[PDB]
Symmetry: D4
Subunit: 158 residues, 8 copies
Amino acid sequence: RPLVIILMGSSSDMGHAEKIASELKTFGIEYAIRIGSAHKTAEHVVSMLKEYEALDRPKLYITIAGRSNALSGFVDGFVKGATIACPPPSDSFAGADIYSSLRMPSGISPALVLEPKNAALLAARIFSLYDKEIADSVKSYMESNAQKIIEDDSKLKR
Amino acid sequence: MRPLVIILMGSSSDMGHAEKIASELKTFGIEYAIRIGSAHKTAEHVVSMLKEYEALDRPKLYITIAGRSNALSGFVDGFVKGATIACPPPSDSFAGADIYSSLRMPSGISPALVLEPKNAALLAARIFSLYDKEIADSVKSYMESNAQKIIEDDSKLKR
Amino acid sequence: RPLVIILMGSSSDMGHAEKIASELKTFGIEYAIRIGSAHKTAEHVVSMLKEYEALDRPKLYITIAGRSNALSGFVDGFVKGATIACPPPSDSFAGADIYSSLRMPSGISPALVLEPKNAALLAARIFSLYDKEIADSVKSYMESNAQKIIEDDSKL
Amino acid sequence: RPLVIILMGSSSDMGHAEKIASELKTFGIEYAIRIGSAHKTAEHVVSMLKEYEALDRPKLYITIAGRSNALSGFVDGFVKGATIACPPPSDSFAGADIYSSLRMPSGISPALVLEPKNAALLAARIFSLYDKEIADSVKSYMESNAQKIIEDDSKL
Amino acid sequence: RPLVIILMGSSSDMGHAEKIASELKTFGIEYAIRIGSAHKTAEHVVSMLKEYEALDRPKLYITIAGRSNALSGFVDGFVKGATIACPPPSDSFAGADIYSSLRMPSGISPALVLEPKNAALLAARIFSLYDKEIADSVKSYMESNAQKIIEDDSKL
Amino acid sequence: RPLVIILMGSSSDMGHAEKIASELKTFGIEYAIRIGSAHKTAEHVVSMLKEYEALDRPKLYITIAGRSNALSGFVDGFVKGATIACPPPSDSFAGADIYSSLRMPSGISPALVLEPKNAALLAARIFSLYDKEIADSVKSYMESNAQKIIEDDSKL
Amino acid sequence: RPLVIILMGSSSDMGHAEKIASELKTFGIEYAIRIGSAHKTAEHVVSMLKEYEALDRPKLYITIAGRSNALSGFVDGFVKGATIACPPPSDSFAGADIYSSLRMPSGISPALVLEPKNAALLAARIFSLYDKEIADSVKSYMESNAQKIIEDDSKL
Amino acid sequence: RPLVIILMGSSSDMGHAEKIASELKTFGIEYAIRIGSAHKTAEHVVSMLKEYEALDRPKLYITIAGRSNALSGFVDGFVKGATIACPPPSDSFAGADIYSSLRMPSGISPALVLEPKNAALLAARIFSLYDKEIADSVKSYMESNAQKIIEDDSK
């Protein structure tokens, strides 16, 4: 019943969206991958957001936009519930595209997360506050990560 | 049951920043607790504190506040079950480069980074709003109000 | 006759906008001053742009938004003709807000100019390609600037 | 009947120049591609600028120079009408060459644009304020970009 | 009987760890290599430190963590003796991960050294104030390095 | 019996030096405060280092130089034992003077610590491996700091 | 016999120029202070340079321009002998105007020096290769500096 | 007769050093290439400088050191006449090693030039103030660079 809308500005971002989606599927969380440009197809984005917003189910938007990221703040100020910004990595201007996701006005509150798997995890943990099944899944995932590190210590320690 | 936000800062010096976050949560009617604890200097105290909060049978978020190199947000985040939000205090040092210590988490550590204290409070409300209608109404009023003032600034001095 | 629409993201940008407006007036160019947020008042901004775009006259938009500038690319993607981005100055993250004005997607082409007086000049010089009166005022303005520097040197 | 003069500081810039040229051709806008150095061949540049400035037709200059960009300001202070700065991409010093294009004195007003297709698009949109054939070409272009995005979404 | 505990946050840091390990061995210094994350395995790390802190021998901790380095400060605040931070290299964000190792609070004092062999050299030179054999080993090492540069100049 | 030589490149660094000295006093550690430029008075520095190096007591050098720090590496390459770099703070070029302290060649291994009180603490903690009086002093210090934080929490 | 021409792009840099002049006066070196813009009064700059270039005496030019520095490259491309860029200090964009002075094309070789006093000193030291009176003056100046440091250490 | 002493902190710098040399050879200016570390071999660098400082000919030093450049200011604070700092390129920390060459104390005044061919050209142009042959060579050189550019346009 939770839904995560993965909304990217360009078809060029699809590979970054697919990393987020794969990880969401591991948590058993439903997702939808969509494309719209805040700069070029603003009204198409508004229409889309209106469609998803009308759904009576707990939702999150994870917004993906390279270069100067207008999409994440655009979606965040339109929709009611929480959103997550997860821009694709860039080395242009030594990663300075990140400030465009960071520097929001008062009243715009997307959660910024750099890594696609971590964006999925944050989504899961947001639902987990009220969804016991998803909390069980997160618990398993993080315990597994921790056990692997301890197992690496046991195996490789000298 | 009633949402709780634990606002956990690494130093009593962070109180100003924490109080900004707390005051904003109050306007959403969301209960908070403000606490102090250092990931560097008082690790076992933080762990003990977090076990106490985690045993509470209500939906919760942690907002974690640490200046300089932020070890606290990732530390809290890796220990607790639910989501957390990092909202570091502002700093000019090294043209603001302390932000990277909040951004650059390992795989499997997923705190939500938000810069402004009022926006950290906003995000916390919006997370709960997915399930809490009272908070969703409060959020809608707040956001719509923000929008109205801008439209009103335009009408009042557009020329 | 030309119109420059000066659209800013917040009322706090007013002093920056008036520096631009001030200078447009000296070029004999009509301007309008408006406020609208690309993040918080999207439909309102889309609704204002449609009104201006229906006007049968040569028009430019100058867009002013602090912090992460979404406004410039949002407006520029919506309107037909040219636009100019002129963000207010900031020292946040050693001026790193500038990259949000610089890094546009292919197909979004605002002209970035830093100084308010230079945004106005650029707007004047765009009209000047087709407006002889605006061309004369610009020739006058630019020669004055040059003559002052030469005079300054003359005292030395 | 507009003309865009693409002027680059080095023949090494030619790849970048041609990208701008190729795009202008799609808008049906005539262009010239020239080479000349603001630091090493100043009189060759000025002589060129004089010949272009004497043409009675609307014109823009797109100025391309790597490293510390003096060329865009040189051109812009010489010619009457608008100019556009479009420096080639560089990763030297985390891309800090961009600041030499940004940081103009008062009275020097080139339009900074990063992407060569957006420099072409901006020039088209500047002429579009008065050239209807061009306005039409821009509209078809921008609408095609928008429709492609919406098509990409449809597949999903 | 010095001991250097080489503690890294992930097995993906092992190649960097083995560089410090190798160099320490050249100085005759016993090491232990361990894995533990301050973010993900805080209580495991604590347990591990308490064990080493109970040893009555002179000890250093060299702490390795990529991205945002919480491990070095975490360890340093827990243990009584000196520690050394030696993060694995990175060009992400122009190397900005370094600040997470530099910016400690007052009362947290790990020694930051970039290069793994210099982290080993620092460790040695630390023990050398009281340990004559290590002091002789460091002497030989540093004098050789100097003699080689003088030798390179002599071939030229 | 431990000694710390605090060597600064200029009398204008004395404030920073004095912060380190005052803190060393609180750990019961003898210091010398000295002035010598690597760039301007290189032979004076060398002769001074020889005088201290001739002492058979365990010792550290804490080296202070603003701007491009050549002093830390110069001293570190000359002396046998460990040294600590503690540059004075600067916001010049957003703090980029720090790179001159970070970027040592292979075989130069000064401990970089930003804050003067943390430089003193590192020093104490280095001696604490073998000097139980100093370790007692460091235990008091760190435990007091931790207890104060926990006390601050208890008020909440 | 030598002459240093101090050429600034704007009268707003006068204070910076005077610091350079004051220091050159202590070396006994004649200077001229002038103003001319690379972007706005190129002909005027060329005319001035032609006048100084005719003088049969050893000369340097020290070129001062804030923001994006085109001036130093412009002068250096024009004049036969060496030049020194000494831009005014800015903290805008973390000091990134400095890259506009660094990033010269092949064939354009101004010597960059940050500090006004050090620009004066470099100038003196260039003429000193052939001028023994200026060499004697530099020797005294730099020996005064060293002795000041050595003297500061002897008290403190 | 001018002499340029090209002094590098390490043999790994030789590539950069040889680029400067090759250009100086085009001007007819004699060079020496030498190695010494300001960190590790300070008393050797100091003894080397004393040898060059004793030659009665106009001289410049071009100093080359990667990473945190202590060498340029070290040599500049010892020798009498002008020096030129020309560090090798590096992408580390977005090029931030450059600040170690820029940020000299008052009384230390090496000329910073980035490109090896430009360090050579600056060296030539310093000598050119008093050396007519070298002045001639520089006019030929700079006119040739401008001619090639104008030629590029003509094709």
